[PDB]
Amino acid sequence: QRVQSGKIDCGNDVSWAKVPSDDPGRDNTRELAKNITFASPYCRPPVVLLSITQLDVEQSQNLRVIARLYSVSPTGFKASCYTWHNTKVYSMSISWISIEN
Amino acid sequence: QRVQSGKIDCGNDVSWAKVPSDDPGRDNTRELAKNITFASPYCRPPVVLLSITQLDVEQSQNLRVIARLYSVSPTGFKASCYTWHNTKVYSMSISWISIEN
Ligand SMILES: *[C@@H]1O[C@H](CO)[C@@H](O[C@@H]2O[C@H](CO)[C@@H](O[C@@H]3O[C@H](CO)[C@@H](O)[C@H](O)[C@@H]3O)[C@H](O)[C@H]2NC(C)=O)[C@H](O[C@@H]2O[C@@H](C)[C@@H](O[C@@H]3O[C@H](CO)[C@H](O)[C@H](O)[C@H]3O[C@@H]3O[C@@H](C)[C@@H](O)[C@@H](O)[C@@H]3O)[C@@H](O)[C@@H]2O)[C@H]1NC(C)=O
Ligand SMILES: *[C@@H]1O[C@H](CO)[C@@H](O[C@@H]2O[C@H](CO)[C@@H](O[C@@H]3O[C@H](CO)[C@@H](O)[C@H](O)[C@@H]3O)[C@H](O)[C@H]2NC(C)=O)[C@H](O[C@@H]2O[C@@H](C)[C@@H](O[C@@H]3O[C@H](CO)[C@H](O)[C@H](O)[C@H]3O[C@@H]3O[C@@H](C)[C@@H](O)[C@@H](O)[C@@H]3O)[C@@H](O)[C@@H]2O)[C@H]1NC(C)=O
Ligand SMILES: *[C@@H]1O[C@H](CO)[C@@H](O[C@@H]2O[C@H](CO)[C@@H](O[C@@H]3O[C@H](CO)[C@@H](O)[C@H](O)[C@@H]3O)[C@H](O)[C@H]2NC(C)=O)[C@H](O[C@@H]2O[C@@H](C)[C@@H](O[C@@H]3O[C@H](CO)[C@H](O)[C@H](O)[C@H]3O[C@@H]3O[C@@H](C)[C@@H](O)[C@@H](O)[C@@H]3O)[C@@H](O)[C@@H]2O)[C@H]1NC(C)=O
Ligand SMILES: *[C@@H]1O[C@H](CO)[C@@H](O[C@@H]2O[C@H](CO)[C@@H](O[C@@H]3O[C@H](CO)[C@@H](O)[C@H](O)[C@@H]3O)[C@H](O)[C@H]2NC(C)=O)[C@H](O[C@@H]2O[C@@H](C)[C@@H](O[C@@H]3O[C@H](CO)[C@H](O)[C@H](O)[C@H]3O[C@@H]3O[C@@H](C)[C@@H](O)[C@@H](O)[C@@H]3O)[C@@H](O)[C@@H]2O)[C@H]1NC(C)=O
Ligand SMILES: CC(=O)N[C@@H]1[C@@H](O)[C@@H](O)[C@@H](CO)O[C@@H]1O
Ligand SMILES: CC(=O)N[C@@H]1[C@@H](O)[C@@H](O)[C@@H](CO)O[C@@H]1O
Ligand code: NA
Ligand code: NA
Ligand SMILES: [Zn+2]
């Protein structure tokens, strides 16, 4: 079926946004969220899978990363690179595939 | 006996030095160390007591502070304001007294 793919480059976390934490055991929650628009819209939300295909993380603090999928519409999806506490992310990229349901 | 007093103002931790940690359970150890010279030297090392008399610390991370006394000579002493991990110190001051032994 209609299969589409792309890659989100989140870059250095200095440019990421503070976001409220959804977990009281995590603080300093930060993310680079993007609304991705499909090159060809679907009529119904496709299945999207995310894959972390680049990481550059500081060794002196724990590695803490999430590739978050927030929502999928027929025309796009919202995803983020997400970290917390004292992790330092110098780069992170998320490869993705969408497949008609 | 000859009693002397003063106050060390360490200021904002952005200007503090990274120092090697003396405790594997502490990282990001940082300090503002000063070599204090007594206005009137002693012939023997006096007793020095340190007191933390100013603190301005960020509430979003734990408060972690030490007023460290490293050494005392007849002519002075070495002390520091010391913090670690993700504590943010905006100001810290150490009042001190020296008393002939
Ligand atoms: C203008 O449009 C072109 C496409 O027509 C685009 O270039 C293409 O970018 C793709 C990523 O979106 C890249 O595909 C990837 O390649 C990876 C392997 O290299 C794979 O793992 C991925 O799966 C994916 O397939 C294409 O190869 C690339 N095509 C061509 C013909 O270049 C432009 O994107 C921007 O420029 C790209 C060259 C690339 O930048 C380079 O990234 C590398 C490391 O990834 C490195 O940082 C380079 O220094 C950097 O290029 C330099 O800096 C950029 C900003 C520009 O000034 C370049 O001319 C420099 O050489 C990509 O990441 C960039 O977004 C796109 N935009 C611009 C401004 O040209
Ligand atoms: C991707 O697209 C979505 C919509 O589909 C968009 O989110 C929507 O943003 C609307 C503003 O454009 C917002 O409506 C407003 O809501 C106000 C009350 O909250 C009203 O007064 C206004 O009249 C207006 O109606 C929608 O509620 C919102 N919808 C949803 C479902 O979220 C994205 O916009 C970006 O993310 C939004 C959540 C929001 O960011 C948040 O802003 C608040 C304070 O306003 C705060 O700073 C939050 O911390 C911030 O969210 C976090 O940071 C952003 C940058 C992302 O990383 C979020 O995931 C984090 O939680 C909005 O201002 C942002 O532009 C849009 N873009 C992205 C990158 O997701
Ligand atoms: C030049 O020498 C004078 C002394 O002759 C010195 O001023 C004295 O500083 C003492 C601290 O070393 C201070 O004693 C303390 O007072 C505290 C209560 O206020 C007590 O808790 C302490 O126990 C201790 O006793 C004296 O009061 C003070 N004396 C006088 C006559 O001023 C200069 O030090 C520098 O200036 C001081 C005025 C002071 O700076 C001020 O600090 C306060 C908050 O503490 C605040 O930040 C003010 O804005 C700041 O003053 C302003 O900025 C400074 C940098 C100068 O530009 C001042 O003219 C401004 O008003 C002290 O901390 C400073 O180091 C000393 N050096 C200079 C450059 O004048
Ligand atoms: C207060 O006075 C003491 C001396 O009584 C002084 O410490 C001495 O500094 C000497 C350099 O001036 C050093 O001698 C050198 O040692 C080298 C080998 O290590 C030789 O190649 C040289 O030929 C020369 O002999 C002495 O070993 C040293 N003595 C002691 C007992 O410490 C203070 O200087 C400051 O602190 C020193 C410890 C040192 O700082 C350290 O430098 C190393 C790499 O050189 C590294 O960056 C450390 O992280 C750093 O120490 C930390 O940061 C400093 C700023 C303080 O916060 C320390 O407590 C931390 O551990 C020296 O370079 C510094 O100027 C002097 N001043 C202060 C503020 O304490
Ligand atoms: C407060 C906060 O974010 N705490 C984090 C916790 O969530 C977890 O990531 C842990 C191990 O890496 O490191 C810290 O304790
Ligand atoms: C690695 C490191 O510095 N860890 C610190 C630990 O030393 C202690 O201060 C604790 C409670 O505040 O917070 C962190 O876990
Ligand atoms: Na490590
Ligand atoms: Na608090
Ligand atoms: Zn921690």
Coordinates of C-alpha atoms and ligand atoms in Angstrom, one line a residue:
Chain A
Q1 CA 0.0 0.0 0.0
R2 CA 1.1 3.6 0.1
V3 CA 4.4 3.4 2.1
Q4 CA 6.2 6.6 2.9
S5 CA 9.4 7.3 4.9
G6 CA 11.4 10.1 6.2
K7 CA 13.8 11.2 8.9
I8 CA 13.5 13.8 11.6
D9 CA 16.7 15.4 12.7
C10 CA 16.4 16.9 16.1
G11 CA 19.9 18.2 16.5
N12 CA 21.5 19.5 19.7
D13 CA 19.3 19.7 22.8
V14 CA 20.2 23.3 23.4
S15 CA 17.5 24.1 20.9
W16 CA 14.9 21.7 22.4
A17 CA 11.9 22.9 24.4
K18 CA 11.2 22.4 28.1
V19 CA 8.0 20.5 28.5
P20 CA 5.9 19.6 31.4
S21 CA 6.8 16.1 32.8
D22 CA 4.3 13.3 32.5
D23 CA 6.2 11.4 35.1
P24 CA 7.0 12.8 38.7
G25 CA 10.1 10.7 38.6
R26 CA 11.5 12.7 35.7
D27 CA 12.5 16.3 35.7
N28 CA 14.0 18.7 33.3
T29 CA 11.9 17.0 30.5
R30 CA 12.9 18.5 27.1
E31 CA 11.9 17.7 23.6
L32 CA 12.2 18.6 19.9
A33 CA 8.7 17.9 18.6
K34 CA 7.7 18.1 14.9
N35 CA 4.4 17.9 13.1
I36 CA 5.3 15.9 10.0
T37 CA 3.0 16.3 6.9
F38 CA 2.9 13.3 4.6
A39 CA 4.0 14.0 1.0
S40 CA 0.8 12.1 0.0
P41 CA -2.1 12.3 2.4
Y42 CA -4.0 9.2 3.4
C43 CA -7.8 9.2 4.0
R44 CA -7.4 7.4 7.3
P45 CA -4.5 7.5 9.9
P46 CA -1.7 5.2 8.7
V47 CA 0.5 3.0 10.9
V48 CA 3.7 4.9 11.8
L49 CA 6.8 3.3 13.3
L50 CA 9.7 5.4 14.6
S51 CA 13.4 4.2 14.7
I52 CA 16.3 6.1 16.4
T53 CA 19.0 6.1 13.7
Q54 CA 21.4 8.7 15.0
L55 CA 22.5 9.4 18.6
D56 CA 25.4 11.5 20.0
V57 CA 25.1 11.6 23.8
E58 CA 27.4 12.9 26.5
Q59 CA 29.1 10.1 28.4
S60 CA 29.2 11.8 31.8
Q61 CA 25.5 11.6 32.4
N62 CA 23.1 8.8 31.9
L63 CA 21.6 8.2 28.5
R64 CA 18.0 9.0 28.5
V65 CA 16.1 9.1 25.2
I66 CA 12.7 8.5 23.9
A67 CA 11.4 8.7 20.3
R68 CA 7.8 9.7 21.1
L69 CA 4.9 9.2 18.8
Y70 CA 2.1 11.6 20.0
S71 CA -0.6 11.4 17.3
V72 CA -1.2 10.2 13.7
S73 CA -3.8 11.8 11.4
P74 CA -4.5 11.0 7.8
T75 CA -2.3 14.0 6.8
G76 CA 0.6 13.7 9.2
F77 CA 1.9 12.8 12.6
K78 CA 3.4 14.4 15.6
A79 CA 6.7 12.9 17.0
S80 CA 9.5 14.1 19.2
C81 CA 13.0 13.4 20.4
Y82 CA 12.7 13.5 24.2
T83 CA 15.2 13.5 27.0
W84 CA 15.2 14.4 30.7
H85 CA 17.2 15.1 33.8
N86 CA 20.9 15.9 33.2
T87 CA 21.3 14.0 29.9
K88 CA 23.1 15.9 27.2
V89 CA 22.0 15.1 23.6
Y90 CA 24.2 16.6 20.9
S91 CA 22.2 15.0 18.1
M92 CA 19.4 12.6 17.6
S93 CA 17.5 11.6 14.5
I94 CA 14.4 9.6 14.1
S95 CA 13.7 7.6 10.9
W96 CA 10.1 6.8 10.3
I97 CA 7.9 4.7 8.0
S98 CA 4.1 5.1 7.4
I99 CA 2.0 2.4 6.0
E100 CA -1.6 2.6 4.9
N101 CA -3.6 0.7 7.5
Chain B
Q1 CA 43.9 35.8 72.0
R2 CA 44.3 37.2 68.5
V3 CA 40.8 36.6 67.0
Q4 CA 40.3 37.5 63.3
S5 CA 37.1 37.3 61.2
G6 CA 36.1 37.7 57.6
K7 CA 33.7 36.6 54.9
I8 CA 34.3 34.8 51.6
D9 CA 31.8 35.6 48.9
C10 CA 31.7 32.9 46.3
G11 CA 29.1 34.3 44.1
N12 CA 27.3 32.5 41.3
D13 CA 28.5 29.0 40.4
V14 CA 29.0 29.8 36.8
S15 CA 32.3 31.2 37.9
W16 CA 33.3 28.1 40.0
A17 CA 35.9 25.5 39.0
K18 CA 35.3 21.9 38.1
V19 CA 37.2 19.8 40.5
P20 CA 37.9 16.1 40.7
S21 CA 35.4 14.3 42.9
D22 CA 36.6 12.8 46.2
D23 CA 33.4 10.7 46.3
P24 CA 32.4 8.3 43.4
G25 CA 28.8 9.0 44.4
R26 CA 29.2 12.6 43.6
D27 CA 29.7 14.0 40.1
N28 CA 30.0 17.4 38.6
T29 CA 31.9 18.5 41.7
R30 CA 32.5 22.3 41.5
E31 CA 34.0 24.8 43.9
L32 CA 35.1 28.4 44.5
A33 CA 38.2 28.0 46.5
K34 CA 40.2 30.9 48.1
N35 CA 43.5 31.1 49.9
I36 CA 42.7 33.6 52.7
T37 CA 45.7 35.5 54.1
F38 CA 45.3 36.7 57.8
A39 CA 45.6 40.4 58.2
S40 CA 47.9 39.6 61.2
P41 CA 49.9 36.3 60.8
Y42 CA 50.1 33.9 63.7
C43 CA 53.3 31.9 64.5
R44 CA 51.3 28.6 64.6
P45 CA 48.1 27.5 62.7
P46 CA 45.1 29.0 64.5
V47 CA 41.7 27.3 64.8
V48 CA 39.4 28.3 62.0
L49 CA 35.6 27.8 62.0
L50 CA 33.5 28.4 58.8
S51 CA 29.8 29.4 58.8
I52 CA 27.5 29.6 55.7
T53 CA 25.9 33.0 56.1
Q54 CA 24.4 33.5 52.6
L55 CA 22.8 31.0 50.3
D56 CA 20.7 31.5 47.1
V57 CA 20.0 28.1 45.5
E58 CA 17.7 27.0 42.7
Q59 CA 14.6 25.2 44.0
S60 CA 14.2 22.8 41.1
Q61 CA 17.3 20.7 42.0
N62 CA 18.5 19.4 45.3
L63 CA 20.4 21.7 47.6
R64 CA 23.9 20.4 47.9
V65 CA 26.5 22.6 49.6
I66 CA 29.7 22.3 51.6
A67 CA 31.8 24.9 53.2
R68 CA 35.1 23.1 53.0
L69 CA 38.2 23.9 55.1
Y70 CA 41.2 22.4 53.2
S71 CA 44.2 23.6 55.3
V72 CA 45.2 26.2 57.9
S73 CA 48.8 27.7 58.1
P74 CA 50.1 30.3 60.5
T75 CA 49.6 32.9 57.7
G76 CA 46.2 31.9 56.2
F77 CA 43.8 29.1 55.3
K78 CA 42.3 27.5 52.2
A79 CA 38.5 27.1 52.1
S80 CA 35.8 26.7 49.4
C81 CA 32.2 26.8 48.6
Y82 CA 31.5 23.4 47.1
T83 CA 28.6 21.9 45.2
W84 CA 27.9 19.0 43.0
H85 CA 25.6 17.2 40.6
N86 CA 22.9 19.4 39.2
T87 CA 22.6 21.9 42.1
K88 CA 22.5 25.6 41.0
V89 CA 24.1 28.0 43.4
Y90 CA 23.4 31.7 42.6
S91 CA 25.3 32.9 45.7
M92 CA 27.0 31.5 48.7
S93 CA 29.1 33.2 51.3
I94 CA 31.2 31.8 54.1
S95 CA 31.9 33.8 57.3
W96 CA 34.9 32.7 59.3
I97 CA 36.6 33.2 62.6
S98 CA 40.3 32.4 63.4
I99 CA 41.4 32.0 67.0
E100 CA 45.0 31.6 68.2
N101 CA 45.3 28.0 69.3
Ligands
LIG1 C1 18.1 20.6 -0.1 O1 17.6 19.4 -0.6 C2 18.5 18.3 -0.7 C3 17.8 17.1 -1.3 O2 17.5 17.4 -2.7 C4 19.0 18.0 0.8 O3 20.1 17.0 0.7 C5 19.7 15.7 1.0 O4 19.5 15.6 2.4 C6 19.0 14.3 2.7 C7 18.5 14.4 4.2 O5 17.3 15.1 4.2 C8 20.1 13.2 2.5 O6 19.6 12.0 2.6 C9 20.0 11.3 3.8 O7 21.3 10.8 3.6 C10 21.9 10.0 4.8 C11 23.3 9.6 4.4 O8 24.1 10.8 4.0 C12 20.9 8.9 5.1 O9 21.3 8.1 6.4 C13 19.5 9.3 5.3 O10 18.6 8.1 5.3 C14 19.0 10.2 4.2 O11 18.8 9.4 3.0 C15 20.6 13.3 1.0 O12 21.8 12.6 0.8 C16 20.8 14.7 0.6 N1 21.0 14.8 -0.8 C17 22.0 15.5 -1.4 C18 22.0 15.4 -3.0 O13 22.8 16.3 -0.8 C19 19.5 19.2 1.6 O14 19.7 18.8 2.9 C20 20.8 19.4 3.5 O15 22.0 19.2 2.9 C21 22.4 17.8 2.8 C22 23.6 17.6 1.9 C23 22.6 17.3 4.2 O16 23.5 18.1 4.9 C24 24.7 17.4 5.3 O17 24.6 16.5 6.4 C25 25.8 15.9 6.6 C26 25.7 14.7 7.6 O18 24.4 14.2 7.4 C27 26.8 16.9 7.1 O19 26.4 17.6 8.3 C28 27.1 17.8 6.0 O20 28.0 18.7 6.4 C29 25.7 18.5 5.6 O21 25.9 19.2 4.4 C30 26.4 20.6 4.5 O22 25.5 21.4 5.3 C31 24.2 21.5 4.7 C32 23.3 22.2 5.8 C33 24.3 22.2 3.4 O23 24.9 23.5 3.5 C34 25.1 21.3 2.4 O24 25.3 21.8 1.1 C35 26.5 21.1 3.1 O25 27.3 20.2 2.3 C36 21.2 17.4 4.9 O26 21.3 16.9 6.2 C37 20.8 18.9 5.0 O27 19.6 19.1 5.6 C38 18.5 20.4 1.4 N2 18.8 21.6 2.1 C39 19.9 22.4 1.8 C40 20.1 23.6 2.7 O28 20.7 22.1 0.9
LIG2 C1 1.8 20.8 16.2 O1 0.4 21.0 16.0 C2 -0.4 21.1 17.2 C3 -1.9 21.2 16.8 O2 -2.3 20.0 16.1 C4 0.0 22.3 18.0 O3 -0.6 22.2 19.3 C5 -1.7 23.2 19.5 O4 -1.1 24.5 19.6 C6 -2.2 25.5 19.6 C7 -1.5 26.8 19.5 O5 -1.1 26.9 18.1 C8 -3.0 25.3 20.9 O6 -4.1 26.1 20.9 C9 -4.0 27.3 21.7 O7 -4.3 26.9 23.1 C10 -4.3 27.9 24.0 C11 -4.5 27.3 25.4 O8 -3.5 26.3 25.7 C12 -5.3 29.0 23.6 O9 -5.3 30.3 24.4 C13 -5.2 29.5 22.2 O10 -6.3 30.2 21.8 C14 -5.0 28.3 21.2 O11 -6.3 27.7 21.0 C15 -3.5 23.9 21.1 O12 -4.0 23.6 22.4 C16 -2.4 22.8 20.7 N1 -3.0 21.5 20.6 C17 -2.5 20.4 21.1 C18 -3.3 19.1 20.8 O13 -1.4 20.4 21.7 C19 1.6 22.3 18.2 O14 1.9 23.6 18.8 C20 3.0 23.5 19.8 O15 2.7 22.6 20.8 C21 1.5 23.0 21.6 C22 1.2 21.9 22.6 C23 1.8 24.4 22.2 O16 3.0 24.3 23.0 C24 2.8 24.5 24.4 O17 2.6 25.8 24.8 C25 2.4 25.9 26.1 C26 1.9 27.3 26.6 O18 1.0 27.7 25.6 C27 3.7 25.6 26.9 O19 4.7 26.4 26.5 C28 4.0 24.2 26.6 O20 5.1 23.8 27.3 C29 4.1 24.0 25.1 O21 4.2 22.6 24.7 C30 5.5 22.0 24.7 O22 6.4 22.7 23.8 C31 6.0 22.6 22.5 C32 6.9 23.5 21.6 C33 6.0 21.1 22.1 O23 7.3 20.5 22.3 C34 4.9 20.4 22.9 O24 4.7 19.0 22.6 C35 5.3 20.6 24.4 O25 4.3 20.0 25.2 C36 2.0 25.3 21.1 O26 2.2 26.7 21.6 C37 3.2 24.9 20.3 O27 3.5 25.7 19.2 C38 2.3 22.1 16.9 N2 3.8 22.0 17.0 C39 4.5 21.1 17.6 C40 6.0 21.3 17.5 O28 4.0 20.2 18.3
LIG3 C1 36.0 48.8 49.1 O1 36.2 48.7 50.5 C2 35.0 48.8 51.2 C3 35.3 48.8 52.7 O2 36.0 49.9 53.1 C4 34.0 47.6 50.8 O3 32.7 47.9 51.4 C5 32.4 47.1 52.6 O4 32.2 45.7 52.2 C6 32.0 44.9 53.3 C7 32.1 43.5 52.8 O5 33.4 43.2 52.5 C8 30.7 45.3 54.0 O6 30.6 44.5 55.2 C9 29.7 43.5 55.2 O7 28.4 44.0 55.4 C10 27.3 43.0 55.4 C11 26.0 43.8 55.5 O8 25.8 44.8 54.5 C12 27.6 42.0 56.6 O9 26.6 40.9 56.6 C13 29.0 41.5 56.5 O10 29.3 40.8 57.8 C14 30.1 42.5 56.3 O11 30.2 43.2 57.5 C15 30.7 46.7 54.4 O12 29.4 47.2 54.8 C16 31.2 47.6 53.3 N1 31.4 49.0 53.7 C17 31.0 50.1 53.1 C18 31.4 51.4 53.8 O13 30.5 50.1 52.0 C19 33.9 47.5 49.3 O14 33.2 46.3 49.1 C20 32.3 46.3 48.0 O15 31.3 47.3 48.1 C21 30.4 47.1 49.3 C22 29.5 48.4 49.5 C23 29.7 45.8 49.1 O16 29.0 45.8 47.9 C24 27.5 45.8 48.0 O17 27.0 44.5 48.4 C25 25.6 44.6 48.5 C26 25.0 43.3 49.1 O18 26.0 42.9 50.1 C27 25.0 44.8 47.2 O19 25.3 43.9 46.2 C28 25.5 46.2 46.7 O20 24.8 46.5 45.5 C29 27.0 46.2 46.7 O21 27.5 47.6 46.5 C30 27.5 48.0 45.1 O22 28.4 47.2 44.3 C31 29.8 47.2 44.8 C32 30.5 46.1 43.9 C33 30.3 48.6 44.7 O23 30.2 49.1 43.3 C34 29.5 49.5 45.6 O24 29.9 50.9 45.7 C35 28.0 49.5 45.2 O25 27.2 50.2 46.1 C36 30.7 44.7 49.1 O26 30.1 43.4 49.0 C37 31.6 45.0 47.9 O27 32.7 44.0 47.7 C38 35.2 47.5 48.6 N2 35.2 47.4 47.2 C39 34.7 48.3 46.3 C40 34.8 48.0 44.8 O28 34.1 49.3 46.7
LIG4 C1 46.1 28.2 46.8 O1 47.5 27.9 47.1 C2 47.9 26.5 46.8 C3 49.3 26.3 47.2 O2 49.5 26.4 48.6 C4 47.7 26.3 45.3 O3 47.9 24.9 45.0 C5 49.2 24.6 44.3 O4 49.2 25.1 43.0 C6 50.5 24.9 42.4 C7 50.5 25.7 41.1 O5 50.6 27.1 41.5 C8 50.8 23.4 42.3 O6 52.1 23.2 41.9 C9 52.3 22.8 40.5 O7 52.0 21.5 40.4 C10 52.1 20.9 39.1 C11 51.7 19.4 39.1 O8 50.4 19.3 39.6 C12 53.6 21.2 38.5 O9 53.8 20.8 37.1 C13 54.0 22.6 38.7 O10 55.4 22.7 38.5 C14 53.7 23.2 40.1 O11 54.6 22.7 41.0 C15 50.7 22.7 43.6 O12 50.6 21.2 43.5 C16 49.4 23.1 44.3 N1 49.4 22.6 45.7 C17 48.4 22.1 46.4 C18 48.7 21.6 47.8 O13 47.3 21.9 45.9 C19 46.4 26.7 44.7 O14 46.4 26.7 43.3 C20 45.2 26.3 42.7 O15 44.8 25.0 43.1 C21 45.7 23.9 42.8 C22 45.4 22.6 43.4 C23 45.9 23.9 41.3 O16 44.6 23.7 40.7 C24 44.5 22.4 40.0 O17 45.1 22.4 38.8 C25 44.9 21.1 38.2 C26 45.8 20.9 36.9 O18 47.0 21.6 37.2 C27 43.5 20.9 37.8 O19 43.0 21.9 37.0 C28 42.7 20.9 39.1 O20 41.4 20.6 38.8 C29 43.0 22.2 39.9 O21 42.4 22.2 41.2 C30 41.0 22.5 41.3 O22 40.7 23.8 40.9 C31 41.4 24.8 41.6 C32 41.2 26.2 40.9 C33 41.0 24.8 43.1 O23 39.5 24.9 43.2 C34 41.4 23.4 43.7 O24 41.1 23.2 45.0 C35 40.7 22.3 42.8 O25 41.1 21.0 43.2 C36 46.4 25.2 40.8 O26 46.6 25.3 39.4 C37 45.4 26.3 41.2 O27 45.8 27.6 40.9 C38 46.0 28.1 45.3 N2 44.6 28.6 44.9 C39 43.5 28.1 45.2 C40 42.2 28.8 44.7 O28 43.4 27.1 45.9
LIG5 C1 14.3 13.5 38.5 C2 14.8 12.6 37.4 O1 14.7 13.0 36.2 N1 15.5 11.6 37.8 C3 16.2 10.6 36.9 C4 15.3 9.4 36.8 O2 14.1 9.7 36.1 C5 16.0 8.3 36.0 O3 16.2 8.7 34.6 C6 17.4 8.0 36.6 C7 18.3 7.0 35.9 O4 18.9 7.6 34.7 O5 18.1 9.2 36.7 C8 17.5 10.3 37.5 O6 17.4 9.8 38.8
LIG6 C1 26.2 11.5 40.9 C2 25.7 12.4 42.0 O1 26.3 13.5 42.2 N1 24.6 12.0 42.6 C3 23.9 12.8 43.6 C4 24.2 12.2 45.0 O2 25.6 12.5 45.3 C5 23.4 12.9 46.0 O3 23.8 14.3 46.2 C6 21.9 12.8 45.6 C7 20.9 13.5 46.6 O4 20.9 15.0 46.4 O5 21.7 13.4 44.3 C8 22.4 12.7 43.3 O6 22.0 11.4 43.2
NA7 NA 30.0 7.2 30.9
NA8 NA 12.0 22.6 45.3
ZN9 ZN 20.5 13.3 39.2

